[PDB]
Short mmCIF file of C-alpha atoms (C1' of nucleotides) and ligand atoms in Angstrom, two decimals:
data_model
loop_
_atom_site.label_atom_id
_atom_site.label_comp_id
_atom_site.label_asym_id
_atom_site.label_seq_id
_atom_site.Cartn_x
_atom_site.Cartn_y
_atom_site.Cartn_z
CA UNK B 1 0.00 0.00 0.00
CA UNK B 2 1.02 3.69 -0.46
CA UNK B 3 3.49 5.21 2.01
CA UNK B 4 0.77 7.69 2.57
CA UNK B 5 -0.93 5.36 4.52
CA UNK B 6 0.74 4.87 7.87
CA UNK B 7 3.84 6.30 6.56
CA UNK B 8 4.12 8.44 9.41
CA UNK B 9 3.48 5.80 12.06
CA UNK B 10 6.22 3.20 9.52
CA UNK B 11 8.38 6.11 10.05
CA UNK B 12 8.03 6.78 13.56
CA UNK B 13 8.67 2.78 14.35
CA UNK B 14 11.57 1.88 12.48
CA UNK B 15 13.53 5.17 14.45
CA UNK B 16 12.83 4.02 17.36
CA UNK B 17 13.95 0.62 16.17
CA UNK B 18 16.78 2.40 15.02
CA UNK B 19 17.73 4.28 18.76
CA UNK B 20 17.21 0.97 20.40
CA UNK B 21 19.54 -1.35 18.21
CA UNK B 22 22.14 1.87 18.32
CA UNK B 23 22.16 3.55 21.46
CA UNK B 24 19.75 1.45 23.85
CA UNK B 25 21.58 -1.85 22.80
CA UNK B 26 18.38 -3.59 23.23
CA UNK B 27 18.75 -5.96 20.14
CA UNK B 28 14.92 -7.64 21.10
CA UNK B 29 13.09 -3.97 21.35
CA UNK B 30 14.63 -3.49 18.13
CA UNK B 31 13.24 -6.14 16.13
CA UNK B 32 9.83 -5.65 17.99
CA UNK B 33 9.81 -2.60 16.48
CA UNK B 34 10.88 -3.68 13.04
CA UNK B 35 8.09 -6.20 13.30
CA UNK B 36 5.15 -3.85 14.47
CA UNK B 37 6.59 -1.91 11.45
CA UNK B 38 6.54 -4.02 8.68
CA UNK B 39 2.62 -5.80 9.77
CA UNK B 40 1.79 -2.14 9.71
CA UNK B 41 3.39 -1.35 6.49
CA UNK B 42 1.41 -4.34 4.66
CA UNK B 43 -2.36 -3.37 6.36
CA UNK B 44 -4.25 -1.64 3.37
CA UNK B 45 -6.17 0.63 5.72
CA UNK B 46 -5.03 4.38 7.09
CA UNK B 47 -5.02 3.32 10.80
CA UNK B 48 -7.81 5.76 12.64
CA UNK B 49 -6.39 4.39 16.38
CA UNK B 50 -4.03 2.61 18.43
CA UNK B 51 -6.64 -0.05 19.03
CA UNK B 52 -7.29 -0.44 15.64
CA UNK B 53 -3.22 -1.36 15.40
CA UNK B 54 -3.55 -3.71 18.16
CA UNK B 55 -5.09 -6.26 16.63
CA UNK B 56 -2.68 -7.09 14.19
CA UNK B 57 0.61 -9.45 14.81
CA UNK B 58 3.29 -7.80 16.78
CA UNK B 59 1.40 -4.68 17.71
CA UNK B 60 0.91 -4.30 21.25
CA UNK B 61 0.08 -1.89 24.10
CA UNK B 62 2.92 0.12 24.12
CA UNK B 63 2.91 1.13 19.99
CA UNK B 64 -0.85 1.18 20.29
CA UNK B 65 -0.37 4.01 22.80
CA UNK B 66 2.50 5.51 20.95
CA UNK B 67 -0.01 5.56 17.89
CA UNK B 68 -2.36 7.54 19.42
CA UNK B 69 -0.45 9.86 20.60
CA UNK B 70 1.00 10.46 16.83
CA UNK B 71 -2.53 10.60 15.32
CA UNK B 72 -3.89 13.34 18.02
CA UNK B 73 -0.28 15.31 17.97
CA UNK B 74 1.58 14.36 14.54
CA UNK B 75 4.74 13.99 16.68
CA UNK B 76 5.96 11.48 19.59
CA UNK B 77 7.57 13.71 22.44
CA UNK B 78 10.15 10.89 23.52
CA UNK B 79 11.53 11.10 19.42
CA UNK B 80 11.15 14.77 19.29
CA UNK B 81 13.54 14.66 22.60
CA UNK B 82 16.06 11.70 21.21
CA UNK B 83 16.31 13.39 18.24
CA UNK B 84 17.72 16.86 19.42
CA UNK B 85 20.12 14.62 22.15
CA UNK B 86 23.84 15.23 20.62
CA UNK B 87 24.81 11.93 22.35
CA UNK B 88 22.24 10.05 21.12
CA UNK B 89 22.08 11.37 17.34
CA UNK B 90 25.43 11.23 17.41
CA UNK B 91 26.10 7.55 18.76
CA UNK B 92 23.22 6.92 16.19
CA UNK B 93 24.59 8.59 13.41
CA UNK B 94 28.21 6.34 13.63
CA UNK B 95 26.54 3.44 13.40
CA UNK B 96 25.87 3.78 9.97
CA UNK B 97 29.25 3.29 8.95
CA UNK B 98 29.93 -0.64 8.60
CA UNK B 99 31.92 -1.94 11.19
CA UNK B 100 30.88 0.88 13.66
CA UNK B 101 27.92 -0.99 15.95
CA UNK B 102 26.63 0.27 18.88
CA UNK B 103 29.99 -0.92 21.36
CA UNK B 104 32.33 1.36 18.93
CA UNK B 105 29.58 4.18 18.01
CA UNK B 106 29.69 4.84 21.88
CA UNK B 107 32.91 5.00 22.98
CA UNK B 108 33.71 7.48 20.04
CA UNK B 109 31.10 9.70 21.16
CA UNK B 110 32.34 9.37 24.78
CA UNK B 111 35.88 10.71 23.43
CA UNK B 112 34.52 13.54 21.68
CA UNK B 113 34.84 11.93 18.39
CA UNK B 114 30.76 12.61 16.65
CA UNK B 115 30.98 13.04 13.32
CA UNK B 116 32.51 11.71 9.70
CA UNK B 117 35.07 14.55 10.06
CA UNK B 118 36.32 13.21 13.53
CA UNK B 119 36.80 10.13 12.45
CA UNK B 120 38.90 10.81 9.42
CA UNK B 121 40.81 13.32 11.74
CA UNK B 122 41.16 9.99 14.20
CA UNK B 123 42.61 7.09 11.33
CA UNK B 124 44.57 5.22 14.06
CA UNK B 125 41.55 4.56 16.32
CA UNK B 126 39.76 2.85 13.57
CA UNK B 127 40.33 -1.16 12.62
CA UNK B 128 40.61 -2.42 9.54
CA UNK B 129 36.96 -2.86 8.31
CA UNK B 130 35.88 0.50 9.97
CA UNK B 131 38.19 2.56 8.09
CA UNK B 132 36.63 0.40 5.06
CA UNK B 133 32.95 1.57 5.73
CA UNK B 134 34.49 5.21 6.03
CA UNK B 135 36.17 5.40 2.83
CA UNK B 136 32.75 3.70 1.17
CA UNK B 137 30.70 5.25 3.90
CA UNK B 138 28.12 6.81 0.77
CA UNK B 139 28.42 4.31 -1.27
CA UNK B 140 27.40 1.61 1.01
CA UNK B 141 24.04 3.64 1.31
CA UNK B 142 23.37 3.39 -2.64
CA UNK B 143 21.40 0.39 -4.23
CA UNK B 144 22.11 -1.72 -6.87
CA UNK B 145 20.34 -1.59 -10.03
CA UNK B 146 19.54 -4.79 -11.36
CA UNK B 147 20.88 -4.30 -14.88
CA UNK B 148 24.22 -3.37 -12.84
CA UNK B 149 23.75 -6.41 -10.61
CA UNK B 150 23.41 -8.42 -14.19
CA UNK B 151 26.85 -6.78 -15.55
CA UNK B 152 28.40 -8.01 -11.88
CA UNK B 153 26.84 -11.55 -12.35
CA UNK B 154 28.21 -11.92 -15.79
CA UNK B 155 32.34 -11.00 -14.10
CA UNK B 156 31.49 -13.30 -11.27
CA UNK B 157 29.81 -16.25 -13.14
CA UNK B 158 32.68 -15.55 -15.75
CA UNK B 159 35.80 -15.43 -13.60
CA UNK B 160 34.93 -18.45 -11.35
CA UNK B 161 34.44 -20.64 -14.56
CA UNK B 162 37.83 -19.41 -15.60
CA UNK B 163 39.73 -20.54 -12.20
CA UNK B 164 38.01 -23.81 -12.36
CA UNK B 165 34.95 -24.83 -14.67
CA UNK B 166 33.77 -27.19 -12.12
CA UNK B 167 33.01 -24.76 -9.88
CA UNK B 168 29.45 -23.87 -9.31
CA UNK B 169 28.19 -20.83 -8.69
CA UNK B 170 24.98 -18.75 -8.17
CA UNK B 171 24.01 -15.20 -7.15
CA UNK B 172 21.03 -15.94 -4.45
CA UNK B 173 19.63 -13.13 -2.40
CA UNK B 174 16.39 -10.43 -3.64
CA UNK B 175 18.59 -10.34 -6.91
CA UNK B 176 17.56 -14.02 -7.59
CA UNK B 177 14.29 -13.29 -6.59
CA UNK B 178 13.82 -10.68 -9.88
CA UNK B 179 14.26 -7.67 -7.62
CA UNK B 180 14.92 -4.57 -9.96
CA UNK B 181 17.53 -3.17 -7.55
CA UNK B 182 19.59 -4.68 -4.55
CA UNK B 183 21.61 -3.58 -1.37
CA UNK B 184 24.52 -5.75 -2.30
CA UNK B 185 25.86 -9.26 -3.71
CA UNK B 186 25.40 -12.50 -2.38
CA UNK B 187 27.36 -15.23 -3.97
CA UNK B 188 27.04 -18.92 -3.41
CA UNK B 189 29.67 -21.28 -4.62
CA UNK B 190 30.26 -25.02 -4.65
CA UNK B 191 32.76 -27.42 -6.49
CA UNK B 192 32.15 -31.39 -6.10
CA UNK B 193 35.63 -31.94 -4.48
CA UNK B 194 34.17 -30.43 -1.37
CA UNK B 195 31.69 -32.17 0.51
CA UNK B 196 30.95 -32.68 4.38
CA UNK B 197 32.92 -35.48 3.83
CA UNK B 198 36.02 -34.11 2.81
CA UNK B 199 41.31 -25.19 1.86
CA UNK B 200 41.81 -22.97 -0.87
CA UNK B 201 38.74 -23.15 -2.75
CA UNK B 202 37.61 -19.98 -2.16
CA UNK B 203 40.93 -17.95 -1.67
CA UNK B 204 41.31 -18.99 -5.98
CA UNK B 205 38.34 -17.57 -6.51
CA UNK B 206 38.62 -14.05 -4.76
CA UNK B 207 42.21 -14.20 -6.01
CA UNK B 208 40.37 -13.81 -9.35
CA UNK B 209 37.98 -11.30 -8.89
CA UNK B 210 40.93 -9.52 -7.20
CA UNK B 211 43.57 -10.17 -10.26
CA UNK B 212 40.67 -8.48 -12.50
CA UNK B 213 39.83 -5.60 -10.29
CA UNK B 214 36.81 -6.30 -9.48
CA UNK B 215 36.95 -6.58 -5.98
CA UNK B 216 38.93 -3.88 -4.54
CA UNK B 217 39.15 -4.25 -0.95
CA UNK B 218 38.95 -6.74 1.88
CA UNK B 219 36.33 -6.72 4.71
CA UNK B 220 37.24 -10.38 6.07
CA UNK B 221 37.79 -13.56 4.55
CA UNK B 222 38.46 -16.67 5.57
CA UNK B 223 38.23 -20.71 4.08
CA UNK B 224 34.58 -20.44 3.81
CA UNK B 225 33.34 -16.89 3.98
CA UNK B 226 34.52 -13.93 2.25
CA UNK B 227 33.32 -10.58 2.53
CA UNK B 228 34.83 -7.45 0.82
CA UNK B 229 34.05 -4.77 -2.11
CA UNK B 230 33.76 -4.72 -5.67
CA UNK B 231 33.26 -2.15 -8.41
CA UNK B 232 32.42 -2.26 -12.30
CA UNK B 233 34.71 -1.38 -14.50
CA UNK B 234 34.23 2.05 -16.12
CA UNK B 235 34.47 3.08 -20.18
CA UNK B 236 36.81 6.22 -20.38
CA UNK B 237 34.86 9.38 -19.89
CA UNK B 238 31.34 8.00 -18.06
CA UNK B 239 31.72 8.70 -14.29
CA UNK B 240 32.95 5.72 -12.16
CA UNK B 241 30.46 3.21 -10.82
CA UNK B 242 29.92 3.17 -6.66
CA UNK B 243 31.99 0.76 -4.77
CA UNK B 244 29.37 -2.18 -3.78
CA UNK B 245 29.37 -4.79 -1.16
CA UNK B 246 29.34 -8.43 -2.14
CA UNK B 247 29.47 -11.62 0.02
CA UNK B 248 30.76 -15.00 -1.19
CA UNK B 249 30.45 -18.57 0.37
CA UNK B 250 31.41 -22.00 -0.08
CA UNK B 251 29.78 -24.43 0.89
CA UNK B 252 30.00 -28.22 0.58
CA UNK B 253 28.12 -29.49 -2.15
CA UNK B 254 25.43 -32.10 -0.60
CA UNK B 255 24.71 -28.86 1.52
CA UNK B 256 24.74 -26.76 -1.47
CA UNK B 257 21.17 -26.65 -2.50
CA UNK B 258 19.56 -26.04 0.77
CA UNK B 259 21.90 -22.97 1.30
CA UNK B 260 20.67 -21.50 -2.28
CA UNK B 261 17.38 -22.37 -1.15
CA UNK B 262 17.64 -20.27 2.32
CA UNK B 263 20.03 -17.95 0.93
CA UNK B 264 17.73 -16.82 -1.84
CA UNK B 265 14.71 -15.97 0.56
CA UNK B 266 13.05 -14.01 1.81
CA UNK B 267 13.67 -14.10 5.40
CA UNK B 268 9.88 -14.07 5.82
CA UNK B 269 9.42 -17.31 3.44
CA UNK B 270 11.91 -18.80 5.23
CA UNK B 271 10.55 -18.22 8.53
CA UNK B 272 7.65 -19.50 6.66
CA UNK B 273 8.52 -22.10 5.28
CA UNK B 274 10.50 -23.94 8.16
CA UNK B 275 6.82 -23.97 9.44
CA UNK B 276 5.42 -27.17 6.73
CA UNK B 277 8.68 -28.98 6.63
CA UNK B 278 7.44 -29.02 10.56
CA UNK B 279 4.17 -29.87 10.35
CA UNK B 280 5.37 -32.63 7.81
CA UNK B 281 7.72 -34.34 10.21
CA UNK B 282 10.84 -32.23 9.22
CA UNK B 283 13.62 -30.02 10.24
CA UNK B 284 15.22 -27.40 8.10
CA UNK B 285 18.05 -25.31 8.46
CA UNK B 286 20.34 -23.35 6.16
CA UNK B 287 22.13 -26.70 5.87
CA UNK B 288 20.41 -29.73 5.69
CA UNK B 289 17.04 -31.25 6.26
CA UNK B 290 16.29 -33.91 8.51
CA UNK B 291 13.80 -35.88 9.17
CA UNK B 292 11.72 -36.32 12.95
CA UNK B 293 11.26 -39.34 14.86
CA UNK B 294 8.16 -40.04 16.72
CA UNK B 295 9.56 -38.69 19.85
CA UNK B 296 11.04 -35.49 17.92
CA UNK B 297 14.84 -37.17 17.76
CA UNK B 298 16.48 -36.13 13.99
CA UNK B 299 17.61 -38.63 11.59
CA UNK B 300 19.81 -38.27 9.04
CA UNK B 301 20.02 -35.74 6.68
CA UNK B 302 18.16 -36.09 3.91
CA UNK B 303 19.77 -36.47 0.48
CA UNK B 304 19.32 -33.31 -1.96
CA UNK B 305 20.63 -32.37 -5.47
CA UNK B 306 18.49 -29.64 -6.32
CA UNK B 307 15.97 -26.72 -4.58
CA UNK B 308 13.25 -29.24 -5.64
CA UNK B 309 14.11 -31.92 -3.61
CA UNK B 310 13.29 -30.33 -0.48
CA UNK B 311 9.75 -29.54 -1.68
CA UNK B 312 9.65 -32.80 -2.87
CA UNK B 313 10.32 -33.75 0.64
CA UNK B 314 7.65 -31.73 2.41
CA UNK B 315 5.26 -32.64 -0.59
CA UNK B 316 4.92 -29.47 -1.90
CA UNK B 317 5.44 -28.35 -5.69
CA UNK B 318 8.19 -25.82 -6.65
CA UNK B 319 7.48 -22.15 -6.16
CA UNK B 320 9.92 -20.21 -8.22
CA UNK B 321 12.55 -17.43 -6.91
CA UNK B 322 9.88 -15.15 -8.46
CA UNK B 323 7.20 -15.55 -6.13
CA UNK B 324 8.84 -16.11 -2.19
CA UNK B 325 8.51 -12.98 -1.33
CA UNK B 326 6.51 -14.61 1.39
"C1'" DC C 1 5.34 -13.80 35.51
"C1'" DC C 2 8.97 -14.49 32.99
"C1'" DG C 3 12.04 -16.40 29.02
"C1'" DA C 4 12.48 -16.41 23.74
"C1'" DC C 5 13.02 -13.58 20.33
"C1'" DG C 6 18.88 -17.12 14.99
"C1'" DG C 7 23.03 -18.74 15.01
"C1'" DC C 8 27.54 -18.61 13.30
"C1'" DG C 9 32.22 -16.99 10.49
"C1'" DC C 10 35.72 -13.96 11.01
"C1'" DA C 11 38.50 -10.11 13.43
"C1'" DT C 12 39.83 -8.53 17.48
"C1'" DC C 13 39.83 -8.17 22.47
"C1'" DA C 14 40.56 -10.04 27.18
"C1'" DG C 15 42.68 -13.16 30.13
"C1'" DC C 16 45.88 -16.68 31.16
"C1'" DG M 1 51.92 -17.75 22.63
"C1'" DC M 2 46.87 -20.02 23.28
"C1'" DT M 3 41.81 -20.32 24.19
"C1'" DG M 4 37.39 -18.34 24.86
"C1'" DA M 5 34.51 -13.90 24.66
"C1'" DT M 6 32.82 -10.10 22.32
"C1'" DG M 7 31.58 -7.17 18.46
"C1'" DC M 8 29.96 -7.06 14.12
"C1'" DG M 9 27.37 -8.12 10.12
"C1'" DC M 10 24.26 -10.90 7.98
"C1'" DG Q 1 8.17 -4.51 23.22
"C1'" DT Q 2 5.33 -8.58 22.10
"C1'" DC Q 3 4.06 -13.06 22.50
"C1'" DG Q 4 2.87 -17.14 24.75
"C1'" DG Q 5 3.85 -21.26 27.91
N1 F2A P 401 16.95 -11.21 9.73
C1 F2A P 401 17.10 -12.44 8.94
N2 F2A P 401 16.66 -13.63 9.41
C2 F2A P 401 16.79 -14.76 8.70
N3 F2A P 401 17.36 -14.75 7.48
C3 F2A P 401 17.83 -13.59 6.94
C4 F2A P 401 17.70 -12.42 7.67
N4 F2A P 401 18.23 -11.43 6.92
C5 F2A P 401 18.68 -11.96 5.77
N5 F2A P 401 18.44 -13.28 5.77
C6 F2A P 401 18.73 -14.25 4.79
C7 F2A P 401 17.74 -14.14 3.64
C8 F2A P 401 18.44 -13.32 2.63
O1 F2A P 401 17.86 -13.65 1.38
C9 F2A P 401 19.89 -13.63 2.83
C10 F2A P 401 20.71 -12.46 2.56
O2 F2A P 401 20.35 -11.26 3.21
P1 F2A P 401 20.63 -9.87 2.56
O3 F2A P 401 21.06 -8.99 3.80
O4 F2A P 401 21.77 -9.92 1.52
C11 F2A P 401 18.97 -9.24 1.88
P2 F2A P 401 18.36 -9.68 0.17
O5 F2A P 401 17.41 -10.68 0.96
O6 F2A P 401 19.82 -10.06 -0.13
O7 F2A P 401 17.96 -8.15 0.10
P3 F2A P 401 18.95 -7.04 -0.38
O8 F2A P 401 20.37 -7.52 -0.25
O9 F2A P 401 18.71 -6.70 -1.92
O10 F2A P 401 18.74 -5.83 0.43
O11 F2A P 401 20.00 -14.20 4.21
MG1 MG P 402 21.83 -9.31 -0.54
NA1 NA P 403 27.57 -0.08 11.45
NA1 NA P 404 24.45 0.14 10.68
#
DNA sequence: CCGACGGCGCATCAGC
DNA sequence: GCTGATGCGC
DNA sequence: GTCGG
């Protein structure tokens, strides 16, 4: 439905979300928040009162009162009064560079340091993935359009075939879904000598993308995960593309399938969808999926070769990328 | 009333 | 030096 | 902050 809507109360949530993840450091008040937002965001009706709120999922007494008072006033005193609080706009404010959370935001802010500025004036006091979200700290705000995240597809799916053509690889996340722009890159990658069964798999492969200069900087990385920048290449003349994030995994192949599977979402489907492999007389995880015993003890996992396997486990029929948005 | 609310890879800290 | 905890991001 | 055992 149209921002319009509840905009204002959306709004109003997701910064108070946003002041208890990064300055209350109440991780559980934040997601309450982001939940009471979202149900909100997806009820087709302007919201007349906070009782009217209530009675959906994840809206209680607290937001139904907060509502009210937004709908008589068109403010909330409490945000009115964080929002003019130098500590706590501050401490808020650092978070948004990556690597800054709420431990680091804080003790800048104790030392005087508040701002962008004071942090490039304060280099030494920054490790080495801070100083990354610095240097990117704008970029790393910017989306992804999805004719860019095709062009970044085609140098990942290319250079990985290059280092070894047994390799597989796929780009999961809201980009597999069909989303027409994304926050970053999510790369999943496999090879059939590694297996649960059975190293330097995935240090060839950044190597690569690195040799190429594509990626162009380092977040962390070690024999499974890597996590680090990339950029597209630029034709003399047109102004240089934004530096993006991207993610890549490896993981072992007869896991393979059920990581594309939760890796491709969303969140919310797989929430969801954890639910009928239950109700069937399964357990599934990013990993594998297992069958329950009578008494609830797991067996095995279960065998899987493909995203249609596990449906064809729980007895359901294949719903493509395209439509679990839920 | 009162505990769950995701869990884990990697970088870095804290303590031994 | 090593092992476990914490911070962080996802 | 919300839910639910
Ligand atoms: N809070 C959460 N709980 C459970 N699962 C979660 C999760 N957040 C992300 N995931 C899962 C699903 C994503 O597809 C996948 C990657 O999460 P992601 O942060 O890359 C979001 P995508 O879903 O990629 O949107 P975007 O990148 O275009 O903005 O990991
Ligand atoms: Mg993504
Ligand atoms: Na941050
Ligand atoms: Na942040």
């Amino acid at each position: 439905p149209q921002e319009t809507l509840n905009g204002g109360i959306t709004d109003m949530l997701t910064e108070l979300a946003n002041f208890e993840k990064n300055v209350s450091q109440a991780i559980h008040k934040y997601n309450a928040y982001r939940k009471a937002a979202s149900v909100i965001a997806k009820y087709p009706h302007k919201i007349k009162s906070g009782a009217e709120a209530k009675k959906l999922p994840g809206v209680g007494t607290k937001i139904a009162e907060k509502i009210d008072e937004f709908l008589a006033t068109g403010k909330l005193r409490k945000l009115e009064k964080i929002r003019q609080d130098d500590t706590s706009s501050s401490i808020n404010f650092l978070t948004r560079v990556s690597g800054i959370g709420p431990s680091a935001a804080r003790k800048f802010v104790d030392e005087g340091i508040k701002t962008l500025e004071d942090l490039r004036k304060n280099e030494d006091k920054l490790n080495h993935h801070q100083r990354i979200g610095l240097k990117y700290f704008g970029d790393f705000e910017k989306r992804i359009p999805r004719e860019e995240m095709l062009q970044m597809q085609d140098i990942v799916l290319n250079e990985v075939k290059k280092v070894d053509s047994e390799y597989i690889a796929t780009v999961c996340g809201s980009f597999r879904r069909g989303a027409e722009s994304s926050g970053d890159m999510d790369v999943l990658l496999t090879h059939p000598s590694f297996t649960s069964e059975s190293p330097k798999l995935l240090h060839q492969v950044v190597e690569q993308l690195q040799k190429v200069h594509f990626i162009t900087d380092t977040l962390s990385k070690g024999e499974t995960k890597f996590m680090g920048v990339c950029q597209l290449p630029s034709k003399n003349d047109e102004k240089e593309y934004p530096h993006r994030r991207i993610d890549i995994r490896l993981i072992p192949k007869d896991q393979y399938y059920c990581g594309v599977l939760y890796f491709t979402g969303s969140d919310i489907f797989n929430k969801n969808m954890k639910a009928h492999a239950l109700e069937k007389g399964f357990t599934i995880n990013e990993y594998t999926i297992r069958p329950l015993g009578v008494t609830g003890v797991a067996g095995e996992p279960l065998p899987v070769d493909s995203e249609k396997d596990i449906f064809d486990y729980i007895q359901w029929k294949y719903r493509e990328p395209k439509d679990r948005s839920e």
